[PDB]
Amino acid sequence: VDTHKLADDVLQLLDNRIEDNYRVCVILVGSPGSGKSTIAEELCQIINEKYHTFLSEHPNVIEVNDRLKPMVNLVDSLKTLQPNKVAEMIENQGLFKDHVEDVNFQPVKYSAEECTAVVARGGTANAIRIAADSINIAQIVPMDGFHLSRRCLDLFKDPQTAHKRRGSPSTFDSNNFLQLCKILAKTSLCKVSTSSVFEKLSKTFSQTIPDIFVPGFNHALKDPTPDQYCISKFTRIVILEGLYLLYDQENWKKIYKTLADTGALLVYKIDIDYEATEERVAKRHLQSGLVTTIAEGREKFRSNDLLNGRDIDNHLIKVDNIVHIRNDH
Ligand SMILES: [Hg+2]
Ligand SMILES: [Hg+2]
Ligand SMILES: [Hg+2]
Ligand SMILES: [Hg+2]
């Protein structure tokens, strides 16, 4: 895949929607070992570098507007987790014991300067937080930070599974990820003599957009960690990468439409080279200690449809704007 070409297409859409959308979103889907993480990172870096180069010769072009307007209310539609219930959750290690597997549990908010926390069935571990060369216009949102915590998985009606199948669609707080998408769509659909996309974006930043903090995944602690990625008023391009962003079940299915309805979405799905990916994933399992030999790793890859990508393909939502890309080496 030509990442510079991707960057060009992203900038083209942002420019086309400059007066209609505050930010553009990019969905990048791929099975384990497809390279979605790295592609997202490179795409992001390329865009920010181009912007920094632009600022070099347009030093004071940045302007923040809407100085006399109120902050966009992102979670007014959510019910407030009353103080008593907040304490209970915290007392219960930041979890909602009776809703860990409830995909219909609606996200709730509460005051955590003022900071608003938004949590769903995964509890505080997957909380989204909203506040009130240095300037980057692109940010990535890995789906990994929404992985349910290990302690959360211990509450599953069947603890044995969940852990054994950690990484399946049901082991992520899809409720809160969808909520992040609704928040992003709301910030995108806010009221927003040159042809330069960077010039246009530089003059249209808005003071009404709050900082949004999203969880990340700590590969060392084997659990999600708070505020690893910040999406601020300066973020005009959000690159979301993950396994289930185009999955046709439960809350995942609502992701595409939620972001597609902004009219500012680019969608990419990685088509893998089976052999190379099989080897890549087998090696990860070996390095991670999950298996004792590469052969055992290859076997797990072949027999687990969550690993070989068969599940993602079988459940790919039927839409006409998914651009399939290759990431061969
Ligand atoms: Hg995996
Ligand atoms: Hg759980
Ligand atoms: Hg808005
Ligand atoms: Hg920030």
UniProtKB/Swiss-Prot annotation:
GO terms for molecular function: ATP binding; ATP hydrolysis activity; kinase activity. CDD domains: AAA. ATP binds at residues 30-38. Its EC number is 2.7.1.-. InterPro entries: P-loop_NTPase (IPR027417). It is an enzyme of class 2 (transferase). Transmembrane segments: none annotated. Keywords: ATP-binding, Kinase, Nucleotide-binding, Transferase. Disruption phenotype: Increases frequency of mitochondrial genome loss. One of its GO terms (cellular component) is cytoplasm. PANTHER family: URIDINE KINASE. Belongs to the YFH7 family. ATP-dependent kinase that could be involved in endoplasmic reticulum membrane assembly. Present with 161 molecules/cell in log phase SD medium. This is ATP-dependent kinase YFH7. The gene is YFH7.
